Design an enzyme around this catalytic site. Structure first.
Site, PDB file in Angstrom:
ATOM      1  N   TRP D  74       0.805  -1.359   0.105  1.00 35.57           N
ATOM      2  CA  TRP D  74       0.036   0.062   0.073  1.00 35.57           C
ATOM      3  C   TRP D  74       0.888   1.383   0.012  1.00 35.57           C
ATOM      4  N   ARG D  76       3.617   1.800  -1.431  1.00 34.61           N
ATOM      5  CA  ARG D  76       4.053   2.212  -2.479  1.00 34.61           C
ATOM      6  C   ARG D  76       3.465   3.300  -3.235  1.00 34.61           C
ATOM      7  N   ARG D  78       2.692   6.771  -3.629  1.00 35.83           N
ATOM      8  CA  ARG D  78       3.502   7.865  -3.097  1.00 35.83           C
ATOM      9  C   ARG D  78       2.864   9.153  -2.997  1.00 35.83           C
ATOM     10  N   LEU D  85       1.995   3.744  13.003  1.00 33.68           N
ATOM     11  CA  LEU D  85       2.261   3.784  14.583  1.00 33.68           C
ATOM     12  C   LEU D  85       3.760   3.470  15.100  1.00 33.68           C
ATOM     13  N   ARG D  86       6.410   4.979  21.079  1.00 32.40           N
ATOM     14  CA  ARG D  86       6.985   6.236  20.917  1.00 32.40           C
ATOM     15  C   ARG D  86       5.890   7.651  20.946  1.00 32.40           C
ATOM     16  N   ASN D 165      -6.665   5.968  -8.699  1.00 31.31           N
ATOM     17  CA  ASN D 165      -5.381   5.010  -9.116  1.00 31.31           C
ATOM     18  C   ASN D 165      -5.041   3.804  -8.396  1.00 31.31           C
ATOM     19  N   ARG D 170      -5.372  -2.104  -7.144  1.00 26.97           N
ATOM     20  CA  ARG D 170      -5.545  -2.956  -5.999  1.00 26.97           C
ATOM     21  C   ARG D 170      -6.995  -3.543  -5.904  1.00 26.97           C
TER      22      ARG D 170
HETATM   23  C1  LIG Z   1      14.494   9.147  13.301  1.00 25.00           C
HETATM   24  C2  LIG Z   1      12.762   8.990  12.299  1.00 25.00           C
HETATM   25  C3  LIG Z   1      11.840   8.428  13.135  1.00 25.00           C
HETATM   26  C4  LIG Z   1      10.412   8.328  12.290  1.00 25.00           C
HETATM   27  N1  LIG Z   1       9.158   7.713  13.112  1.00 25.00           N
HETATM   28  C5  LIG Z   1       8.209   7.632  12.157  1.00 25.00           C
HETATM   29  C6  LIG Z   1       6.834   7.162  12.749  1.00 25.00           C
HETATM   30  O1  LIG Z   1       6.769   6.860  14.074  1.00 25.00           O
HETATM   31  N2  LIG Z   1       5.744   6.750  11.993  1.00 25.00           N
HETATM   32  C7  LIG Z   1       5.878   7.195  10.810  1.00 25.00           C
HETATM   33  O2  LIG Z   1       4.700   7.005   9.801  1.00 25.00           O
HETATM   34  N3  LIG Z   1       7.161   7.416  10.068  1.00 25.00           N
HETATM   35  C8  LIG Z   1       8.108   7.766  10.831  1.00 25.00           C
HETATM   36  N4  LIG Z   1       9.557   8.482  10.192  1.00 25.00           N
HETATM   37  C9  LIG Z   1       9.364   8.559   8.729  1.00 25.00           C
HETATM   38  C10 LIG Z   1       9.011  10.217   8.445  1.00 25.00           C
HETATM   39  O3  LIG Z   1       7.733  10.389   9.071  1.00 25.00           O
HETATM   40  C11 LIG Z   1       8.948  10.237   7.067  1.00 25.00           C
HETATM   41  O4  LIG Z   1       8.030   9.573   6.354  1.00 25.00           O
HETATM   42  C12 LIG Z   1      10.393  10.010   6.336  1.00 25.00           C
HETATM   43  O5  LIG Z   1      11.291  10.488   7.219  1.00 25.00           O
HETATM   44  C13 LIG Z   1      10.262  10.697   4.823  1.00 25.00           C
HETATM   45  O6  LIG Z   1      10.328  12.175   4.947  1.00 25.00           O
HETATM   46  P1  LIG Z   1       9.924  13.120   3.943  1.00 25.00           P
HETATM   47  O7  LIG Z   1       8.531  13.240   3.647  1.00 25.00           O
HETATM   48  O8  LIG Z   1      10.557  14.382   4.121  1.00 25.00           O
HETATM   49  O9  LIG Z   1      10.662  12.443   2.510  1.00 25.00           O
HETATM   50  P2  LIG Z   1       9.855  12.319   1.046  1.00 25.00           P
HETATM   51  O10 LIG Z   1       8.571  11.459   1.506  1.00 25.00           O
HETATM   52  O11 LIG Z   1      10.884  11.893  -0.042  1.00 25.00           O
HETATM   53  O12 LIG Z   1       9.373  13.749   0.844  1.00 25.00           O
HETATM   54  C14 LIG Z   1      10.489  14.773   0.669  1.00 25.00           C
HETATM   55  C15 LIG Z   1      10.135  16.308   0.687  1.00 25.00           C
HETATM   56  O13 LIG Z   1       9.089  16.566  -0.058  1.00 25.00           O
HETATM   57  C16 LIG Z   1       7.860  17.153   0.621  1.00 25.00           C
HETATM   58  N5  LIG Z   1       6.721  16.235   0.337  1.00 25.00           N
HETATM   59  C17 LIG Z   1       6.613  15.056  -0.133  1.00 25.00           C
HETATM   60  N6  LIG Z   1       5.201  14.605  -0.307  1.00 25.00           N
HETATM   61  C18 LIG Z   1       4.576  15.405   0.160  1.00 25.00           C
HETATM   62  C19 LIG Z   1       3.069  15.670   0.814  1.00 25.00           C
HETATM   63  N7  LIG Z   1       2.277  14.807   0.415  1.00 25.00           N
HETATM   64  N8  LIG Z   1       2.829  16.822   1.477  1.00 25.00           N
HETATM   65  C20 LIG Z   1       3.755  17.856   1.836  1.00 25.00           C
HETATM   66  N9  LIG Z   1       4.979  17.615   1.654  1.00 25.00           N
HETATM   67  C21 LIG Z   1       5.575  16.767   0.665  1.00 25.00           C
HETATM   68  C22 LIG Z   1       8.372  17.419   1.968  1.00 25.00           C
HETATM   69  O14 LIG Z   1       8.942  18.762   1.902  1.00 25.00           O
HETATM   70  C23 LIG Z   1       9.454  16.431   2.239  1.00 25.00           C
HETATM   71  O15 LIG Z   1      10.592  16.745   3.013  1.00 25.00           O
HETATM   72  C24 LIG Z   1      10.403   8.398  10.906  1.00 25.00           C
HETATM   73  C25 LIG Z   1      11.991   8.903  10.429  1.00 25.00           C
HETATM   74  C26 LIG Z   1      12.911   9.259  11.237  1.00 25.00           C
HETATM   75  C27 LIG Z   1      14.118   9.616  10.436  1.00 25.00           C
HETATM   76  C1  LIG Z   2      -0.568  -6.396  -9.447  1.00 22.59           C
HETATM   77  C2  LIG Z   2       0.742  -5.492  -9.174  1.00 22.59           C
HETATM   78  C3  LIG Z   2       1.985  -6.214  -8.967  1.00 22.59           C
HETATM   79  C4  LIG Z   2       3.166  -5.250  -8.844  1.00 22.59           C
HETATM   80  N1  LIG Z   2       4.645  -5.822  -8.818  1.00 22.59           N
HETATM   81  C5  LIG Z   2       5.575  -5.070  -8.352  1.00 22.59           C
HETATM   82  C6  LIG Z   2       6.799  -5.619  -8.376  1.00 22.59           C
HETATM   83  O1  LIG Z   2       7.282  -6.853  -8.813  1.00 22.59           O
HETATM   84  N2  LIG Z   2       7.844  -4.796  -7.960  1.00 22.59           N
HETATM   85  C7  LIG Z   2       7.709  -3.481  -7.565  1.00 22.59           C
HETATM   86  O2  LIG Z   2       8.569  -2.666  -7.142  1.00 22.59           O
HETATM   87  N3  LIG Z   2       6.313  -3.005  -7.294  1.00 22.59           N
HETATM   88  C8  LIG Z   2       5.368  -3.880  -8.043  1.00 22.59           C
HETATM   89  N4  LIG Z   2       4.022  -3.244  -7.895  1.00 22.59           N
HETATM   90  C9  LIG Z   2       3.849  -1.665  -7.455  1.00 22.59           C
HETATM   91  C10 LIG Z   2       3.633  -0.865  -8.538  1.00 22.59           C
HETATM   92  O3  LIG Z   2       4.850  -0.903  -9.504  1.00 22.59           O
HETATM   93  C11 LIG Z   2       3.553   0.694  -8.123  1.00 22.59           C
HETATM   94  O4  LIG Z   2       4.524   1.144  -7.196  1.00 22.59           O
HETATM   95  C12 LIG Z   2       2.214   0.807  -7.162  1.00 22.59           C
HETATM   96  O5  LIG Z   2       1.385  -0.080  -8.020  1.00 22.59           O
HETATM   97  C13 LIG Z   2       1.965   2.231  -7.107  1.00 22.59           C
HETATM   98  O6  LIG Z   2       1.346   2.693  -8.257  1.00 22.59           O
HETATM   99  P1  LIG Z   2       1.677   4.261  -8.863  1.00 22.59           P
HETATM  100  O7  LIG Z   2       3.221   4.637  -9.146  1.00 22.59           O
HETATM  101  O8  LIG Z   2       0.729   4.573 -10.157  1.00 22.59           O
HETATM  102  O9  LIG Z   2       1.085   5.076  -7.873  1.00 22.59           O
HETATM  103  P2  LIG Z   2       1.646   6.590  -6.999  1.00 22.59           P
HETATM  104  O10 LIG Z   2       3.151   6.041  -6.565  1.00 22.59           O
HETATM  105  O11 LIG Z   2       0.595   7.058  -5.853  1.00 22.59           O
HETATM  106  O12 LIG Z   2       1.879   7.653  -8.028  1.00 22.59           O
HETATM  107  C14 LIG Z   2       0.624   8.105  -8.544  1.00 22.59           C
HETATM  108  C15 LIG Z   2       0.553   8.591  -9.982  1.00 22.59           C
HETATM  109  O13 LIG Z   2       1.716   9.397  -9.811  1.00 22.59           O
HETATM  110  C16 LIG Z   2       2.603   9.503 -10.987  1.00 22.59           C
HETATM  111  N5  LIG Z   2       4.064   9.533 -10.242  1.00 22.59           N
HETATM  112  C17 LIG Z   2       4.232   9.447  -8.909  1.00 22.59           C
HETATM  113  N6  LIG Z   2       5.650   9.733  -8.566  1.00 22.59           N
HETATM  114  C18 LIG Z   2       6.357   9.675  -9.921  1.00 22.59           C
HETATM  115  C19 LIG Z   2       7.502   9.679 -10.312  1.00 22.59           C
HETATM  116  N7  LIG Z   2       8.389   9.893  -9.451  1.00 22.59           N
HETATM  117  N8  LIG Z   2       7.748   9.705 -11.558  1.00 22.59           N
HETATM  118  C20 LIG Z   2       6.816   9.680 -12.792  1.00 22.59           C
HETATM  119  N9  LIG Z   2       5.660   9.435 -12.205  1.00 22.59           N
HETATM  120  C21 LIG Z   2       5.198   9.405 -11.006  1.00 22.59           C
HETATM  121  C22 LIG Z   2       2.281   8.343 -11.826  1.00 22.59           C
HETATM  122  O14 LIG Z   2       1.418   8.700 -13.170  1.00 22.59           O
HETATM  123  C23 LIG Z   2       1.305   7.542 -10.884  1.00 22.59           C
HETATM  124  O15 LIG Z   2       0.460   6.652 -11.642  1.00 22.59           O
HETATM  125  C24 LIG Z   2       2.907  -3.851  -8.181  1.00 22.59           C
HETATM  126  C25 LIG Z   2       1.632  -3.430  -8.222  1.00 22.59           C
HETATM  127  C26 LIG Z   2       0.540  -4.118  -8.498  1.00 22.59           C
HETATM  128  C27 LIG Z   2      -0.920  -3.478  -8.575  1.00 22.59           C
HETATM  129  O1  LIG Z   3      13.088   5.330  12.410  1.00 18.31           O
HETATM  130  C1  LIG Z   3      11.853   4.951  12.050  1.00 18.31           C
HETATM  131  C2  LIG Z   3      10.857   4.463  12.506  1.00 18.31           C
HETATM  132  C3  LIG Z   3       9.782   4.466  11.907  1.00 18.31           C
HETATM  133  N1  LIG Z   3       9.708   4.686  10.628  1.00 18.31           N
HETATM  134  C4  LIG Z   3       8.498   4.666   9.793  1.00 18.31           C
HETATM  135  C5  LIG Z   3       8.613   3.463   8.742  1.00 18.31           C
HETATM  136  C6  LIG Z   3       7.488   2.376   9.088  1.00 18.31           C
HETATM  137  O2  LIG Z   3       6.401   3.119   8.031  1.00 18.31           O
HETATM  138  C7  LIG Z   3       6.851   2.945  10.354  1.00 18.31           C
HETATM  139  C8  LIG Z   3       7.470   1.981  11.548  1.00 18.31           C
HETATM  140  O3  LIG Z   3       8.552   1.804  11.294  1.00 18.31           O
HETATM  141  P1  LIG Z   3       9.189   0.923  12.483  1.00 18.31           P
HETATM  142  O4  LIG Z   3       9.501   1.733  13.811  1.00 18.31           O
HETATM  143  O5  LIG Z   3       8.487  -0.322  12.716  1.00 18.31           O
HETATM  144  O6  LIG Z   3      10.770   0.615  11.967  1.00 18.31           O
HETATM  145  O7  LIG Z   3       7.412   4.342  10.753  1.00 18.31           O
HETATM  146  C9  LIG Z   3      10.557   5.244   9.975  1.00 18.31           C
HETATM  147  O8  LIG Z   3      10.749   5.352   8.662  1.00 18.31           O
HETATM  148  N2  LIG Z   3      11.910   5.178  10.700  1.00 18.31           N
END
Ligand SMILES: Cc1cc2nc3c(=O)[nH]c(=O)nc-3n(C[C@H](O)[C@H](O)[C@H](O)COP(=O)(O)OP(=O)(O)OC[C@H]3O[C@@H](n4cnc5c(N)ncnc54)[C@H](O)[C@@H]3O)c2cc1C
Ligand SMILES: Cc1cc2nc3c(=O)[nH]c(=O)nc-3n(C[C@H](O)[C@H](O)[C@H](O)COP(=O)(O)OP(=O)(O)OC[C@H]3O[C@@H](n4cnc5c(N)ncnc54)[C@H](O)[C@@H]3O)c2cc1C
Ligand SMILES: O=c1ccn([C@H]2C[C@H](O)[C@@H](COP(=O)(O)O)O2)c(=O)[nH]1
Ligand SMILES: Cc1cc2nc3c(=O)[nH]c(=O)nc-3n(C[C@H](O)[C@H](O)[C@H](O)COP(=O)(O)OP(=O)(O)OC[C@H]3O[C@@H](n4cnc5c(N)ncnc54)[C@H](O)[C@@H]3O)c2cc1C
Ligand SMILES: Cc1cc2nc3c(=O)[nH]c(=O)nc-3n(C[C@H](O)[C@H](O)[C@H](O)COP(=O)(O)OP(=O)(O)OC[C@H]3O[C@@H](n4cnc5c(N)ncnc54)[C@H](O)[C@@H]3O)c2cc1C
Ligand SMILES: O=c1ccn([C@H]2C[C@H](O)[C@@H](COP(=O)(O)O)O2)c(=O)[nH]1
Ligand SMILES: O=c1ccn([C@H]2C[C@H](O)[C@@H](COP(=O)(O)O)O2)c(=O)[nH]1
Ligand SMILES: O=c1ccn([C@H]2C[C@H](O)[C@@H](COP(=O)(O)O)O2)c(=O)[nH]1
Lengths: 210, 214, 216, 211
Positions: D74, D76, D78, D85, D86, D165, D170
Site C-alpha cells: 500500500w 508504494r 507515493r 504507529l 513512541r 489510481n 489494488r
Molecule cells: C528518526 C526517525 C523516526 C521516524 N518515526 C516515524 C513514525 O513513528 N511513523 C511514521 O509514519 N513515520 C516515521 N518516520 C518517517 C517520517 O515520518 C517520513 O516518512 C520519512 O522520514 C520521509 O521524510 P519526507 O516526507 O521528508 O521524505 P519524502 O517522503 O521523499 O518527501 C520529501 C520532501 O517532499 C515534501 N513532500 C513530499 N510529499 C509531500 C506531501 N504529500 N505533502 C507535503 N510535503 C510533501 C516534503 O517537503 C519532504 O521533506 C521517521 C523517520 C525518522 C528519520
Molecule cells: C498487480 C501488481 C504487481 C506489482 N508488482 C511489483 C513488483 O514486482 N515490484 C515493484 O517494485 N512494484 C510492484 N507493484 C507496485 C507498482 O509498481 C507501483 O509502485 C504501485 O502500484 C503504485 O503505483 P503508482 O506509481 O501509479 O502510484 P503512486 O506512487 O501514488 O503515483 C501516482 C501516479 O503519480 C505518478 N507518479 C508519481 N511519482 C512519480 C515519479 N516519481 N515519476 C513518474 N511518475 C510518477 C504516476 O503517474 C502514478 O500513476 C505492483 C503493483 C500491482 C498492482
Molecule cells: O526510525 C523510523 C521509525 C519509523 N519509521 C516509519 C517506517 C514505518 O512506516 C513505520 C514503523 O517503522 P518501525 O518503527 O516499525 O521501524 O514508521 C521510519 O521510517 N523510521
C-alpha cells in the site's frame, strides 16, 4: 559509473548510474552550458540560502540489498522511484558486537544464535508450506522482517540530501544509518562540491561530520 | 546537443540523459540478448507496468513563449529552473499567417500578424521607458505580453514524459505546445527507441504521434 | 473568509479538512477522542514542530480560491506539492500598481505617470485583443498580446506542511511584494483555522522575516 | 462514523473527508458560489475525457489496521500522506489466514493444518521476541524476528484522483487477495461519500475487474 559498498552481513549499496555532476546544478541555476572559483561559490550560495531546486538536476540510480525492516523505512521517502524484486532467501543476523552497551542478561553470541534459530524455523516452515502446495504469496507471510530484499532506487540530489538529513543521524536505527553512510559516500565521490556545501551549510544530522 | 527549432525563435535542446531502454529492463529485473530485452519493454508497456521507465531521465533546455511555459509547468512530476535575472533577452512569438488561416477571419491573416507585431512593439517600448525611468525590472515587466519568450531547464523521467506526450502531443492541446511536444517526442525516440515504439503501440492516448513520424 | 489583495485580487477560503488536532491524531495514529487533553495535545504540536516531525501536518488540508495576476500565479504555481485548477466564462481585469508601490525607488518621472503609462498600455493591448476577437481570431491566439498583469483565478488545495513551505518562501522579504501580500492572507487564514500549528510554526520552523514582525 | 472489518483483526475506518462530488465541480468551474443533472453531467464529462485534476480537491483520511506485507504494498502509492504507529502504545497481533483462504489450491496437507503451522510460527517468533526484550535487547532490534503478518496501523490521507489510481491497481484480480479486501472497503467508503464521482469512475475510468 560503478561503486559497491557492502553493508551488514549480506547487504550492499551499488551505484548503477548517475546523471550529471556538481556543474549540472550550476548550469540549471543559470540556465546555461558552463563547463571554477565562481562555480564553487554559486554551489555554496545556493546551499546556504536553501535554493535547492538546481540540485534536482543531478540524479542517481542505486541497487540496494537490505533487510525488509530497513527497506520499509527507506520506502517512506516518496520523492524517488523504486522497483523491488517480487528470488533468493537470506536473512540479516546481527553480529555480537551490534549488541554492546546494552547489558544483555545473556551473552551477545546467544542473542545472535537465538535470532538465527527462530529465522531458521520460520524459513523451514515457509519451505514446508510451499512444498505442501501453498502459494508463495501466502506462505511468505511467516517470514521475518530481517529477510533481505533488493531494489533499484532512482533519486535526485535534493531528495538525497533530505534522505541523509533523516537517516544519517543518531536518531535513526543503526542499520539504516549504515546504509545512509554508504549512500553519502557515493554522493560525495560523484558530487564533491555539492556534498561538501551540504555538510557545511545544510546537513541537519550528526554522523556525517564524525 | 540535439537542438530542434520551434516556432519563430523557440527551441528544445537536450542537455543530458541518464540511461536508455536498457535502464528500464535492468530496473524491472532489479539486476545490474537484444530481442529478449526488447520483448520485456513491450511486455511492461502492454501490461501497464510503468514504474521501470522512471529510471530513464532527461534534462531539456527549452525556449518558449510564456503562454506555452505556463501550460508546460502544470506538469508537477518534474524539475524546472527558469531564467530570472539574478543568475535576459526580449523576443516575442509572432504567429505566422499560416497559423491563422482556416478560421474564417474578417481581415487577412498577414494583417492579424502585423497587428500582433504592432502591439508587441508598443508594449516593449513602454517596458523600456519604464526601466530607463528607474522602475525596477520585475515591476516594469508586468506590461509585457504573454508571447514573450522565456527559457528553462526541465528534468523529467520517461514515465512522466510519456504522460506529458499523452496530453500535449495531441490535437486537443494548443497548436504551439503540440509543436514543442513533437520535438520532445523526437528526442525521446532517438534515445529510447524501444520504449517509444512500445509507448505508441500500447499506452499512448493522443492522436498526433500515430500519424506524424518522429 | 475572503480577503481583498492588490487592486482587484482576493484570497477566499473554500474548504478545510481538519484542525490542529488532525495532526495530533495522525501522529498518535488514533481516532480515539474520549481522552482529549488540550495541554497535552498543544505540547505535542510544539514537540513535532520543534523536532522537525512534519508529516503529521500533511493531514490538515485547505482549499483556497485565489484571484491574482498571471505574473503572481506563475510564481505560485511553482509549488508542485499541491493541486491547481485554473480558469480557462472569462473576465478581463488587470493589476495596475499604485503610486505608493513605486516609491522607495528613485524614478525619474512621477509615480503617478508610471501608473498612467501602465494603464495606457494595458488599455491598448486589451483593445487590440478585442479587435482581433471581432475579426475571427480564436480566443487562445488573440490572448497572447495580453499583458502579464492580467488577472486569473484558481482553486488551490494544499496541505499544511506544503502551506508552511509556501509561507517560508513567499511570506518573506526576498519574495516579490505582490506575492508577499497574498502569502500574508494565506497566513491569516491558516492561523484562524490552525492556531496552535501556526504559533508553533512561527516559534520553531518559519524561515522568513515578515510573519514575526507583522501580526497575522 | 464508518468502519469496515477486514481479515481476521484488520479494519478500514474513515477519519475525515473534505468535500463531496460538488467539490470537483466547483474546482473545475473555479466557482465558490442548484442543478443536479448539470452537475452530474460535468462529473461524467471530466471522467470520460480524463480531466482528473478536479478530483484532487476531494480528500479523505483513513485509519487502517493491516498486516505489514499488505502495508508494504500500500505504501508504494507515493501520492498520499502516511503516518504509521513512541507517540502511542504498541500491541502485537498477527493475521492468520482462514482455512477458506486456501480453498482452490490443492494442498498436500489440510488447510486447517496450514492455518495451524502459521499460528505456530507467530507464537514461536513472538515468544522469541519477548525473550530477547526481557534479556536487554532493544525492541527495534528484537522485532526483526517478527513475521510479515504482524499487524500495523496507519493514517492515510489521499485525494480522490490518487484514490482512483489505487483502486485501479489494488481492486483488481492481479493484486494479492488480502489487499483486494482492503481496496473493496476503501471503494465502499468512497462510494458513500462521492456517489456521483464513484459511479462515473466505474463507468468510464476504472481499469480493474472486481468492483
Ligand atoms: C528518526 C526517525 C523516526 C521516524 N518515526 C516515524 C513514525 O513513528 N511513523 C511514521 O509514519 N513515520 C516515521 N518516520 C518517517 C517520517 O515520518 C517520513 O516518512 C520519512 O522520514 C520521509 O521524510 P519526507 O516526507 O521528508 O521524505 P519524502 O517522503 O521523499 O518527501 C520529501 C520532501 O517532499 C515534501 N513532500 C513530499 N510529499 C509531500 C506531501 N504529500 N505533502 C507535503 N510535503 C510533501 C516534503 O517537503 C519532504 O521533506 C521517521 C523517520 C525518522 C528519520
Ligand atoms: C498487480 C501488481 C504487481 C506489482 N508488482 C511489483 C513488483 O514486482 N515490484 C515493484 O517494485 N512494484 C510492484 N507493484 C507496485 C507498482 O509498481 C507501483 O509502485 C504501485 O502500484 C503504485 O503505483 P503508482 O506509481 O501509479 O502510484 P503512486 O506512487 O501514488 O503515483 C501516482 C501516479 O503519480 C505518478 N507518479 C508519481 N511519482 C512519480 C515519479 N516519481 N515519476 C513518474 N511518475 C510518477 C504516476 O503517474 C502514478 O500513476 C505492483 C503493483 C500491482 C498492482
Ligand atoms: O526510525 C523510523 C521509525 C519509523 N519509521 C516509519 C517506517 C514505518 O512506516 C513505520 C514503523 O517503522 P518501525 O518503527 O516499525 O521501524 O514508521 C521510519 O521510517 N523510521
Ligand atoms: C488539452 C488540455 C486542456 C487543459 N485545460 C485546463 C484548464 O482549463 N484549467 C487547468 O487548470 N488546467 C488545464 N489543463 C492542465 C491539466 O489540468 C493538468 O494540470 C496538466 O495536463 C498536467 O497533467 P498531470 O496532472 O497528469 O501531470 P503532472 O502534474 O506531471 O502529474 C503526473 C501524474 O502524477 C499524478 N499526480 C501528480 N500530482 C498529483 C496530486 N497532487 N494528486 C493526485 N495525483 C497526482 C497523476 O496521476 C498525474 O497524472 C489542461 C491540460 C490539457 C492537456
Ligand atoms: C525568493 C525566490 C526567488 C526564486 N527565483 C527563481 C528563479 O530565478 N528561477 C526559478 O526557476 N525558480 C525560482 N524560484 C522558485 C523556486 O525555485 C521554487 O520553484 C519554488 O519556490 C517552489 O518551492 P519548492 O520546490 O520547495 O516547493 P514544492 O515544489 O511545493 O515542493 C515542496 C517540497 O517538496 C520537495 N520536492 C517536490 N518535488 C521535488 C522533486 N522533483 N525533487 C526533489 N524534491 C522535491 C522539496 O523538498 C520541496 O521543498 C524562486 C522562489 C523564491 C521564493
Ligand atoms: O490546453 C491547456 C489549457 C489550459 N491549461 C492550464 C495552464 C494554465 O494554468 C491555465 C490557463 O491556460 P490558458 O488556457 O490560459 O493557456 O490552465 C493547460 O495547461 N493547457
Ligand atoms: O521570486 C520568484 C522569482 C522567480 N520565480 C520563478 C517563477 C517563474 O517560473 C520564474 C521567473 O519568474 P519571475 O522572476 O520572472 O517572476 O521563476 C518565482 O517563483 N519566484
Ligand atoms: O502485488 C504487488 C507485488 C509487489 N509489490 C511491491 C511492494 C513491495 O515493495 C515489493 C515486493 O512485494 P511482494 O510481492 O513481496 O508483496 O513490490 C506491490 O506493491 N504489489
Amino acid at each position: 559509473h560503478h561503486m559497491k559498498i557492502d553493508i551488514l552481513d549480506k547487504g550492499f549499496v551499488e551505484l548503477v548510474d548517475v546523471m550529471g555532476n556538481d556543474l549540472s546544478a550550476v548550469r540549471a541555476a543559470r540556465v546555461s552550458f558552463d563547463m571554477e572559483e565562481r562555480d564553487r561559490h554559486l554551489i555554496e550560495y545556493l546551499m546556504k540560502h536553501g535554493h535547492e531546486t538546481p540540485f534536482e538536476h543531478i540524479v542517481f540510480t542505486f541497487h540496494v540489498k537490505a533487510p525488509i525492516f530497513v527497506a520499509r523505512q527507506w520506502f517512506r521517502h516518496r520523492i524517488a522511484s523504486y522497483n523491488e524484486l517480487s528470488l533468493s532467501y537470506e536473512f540479516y543476523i546481527p553480529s555480537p558486537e551490534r549488541l554492546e552497551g546494552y547489558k544483555t542478561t545473556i551473552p551477545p553470541e546467544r542473542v545472535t544464535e537465538k535470532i538465527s534459530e527462530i529465522v531458521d524455523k520460520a524459513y523451514r516452515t515457509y519451505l514446508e508450506l510451499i512444498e505442501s502446495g501453498v502459494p508463495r504469496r501466502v506462505a511468505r507471510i511467516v517470514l521475518p522482517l530481517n529477510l533481505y530484499t533488493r531494489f533499484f532506487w532512482t533519486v535526485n540530489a535534493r531528495s538525497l540530501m533530505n534522505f541523509l538529513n533523516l537517516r544519517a543521524d543518531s536518531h535513526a536505527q543503526w542499520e539504516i544509518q549504515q546504509y545512509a553512510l554508504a549512500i553519502a559516500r557515493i554522493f560525495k565521490e560523484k558530487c564533491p562540491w555539492t556534498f561538501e556545501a551540504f555538510l557545511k551549510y545544510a546537513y541537519k544530522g550528526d554522523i556525517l561530520k564524525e
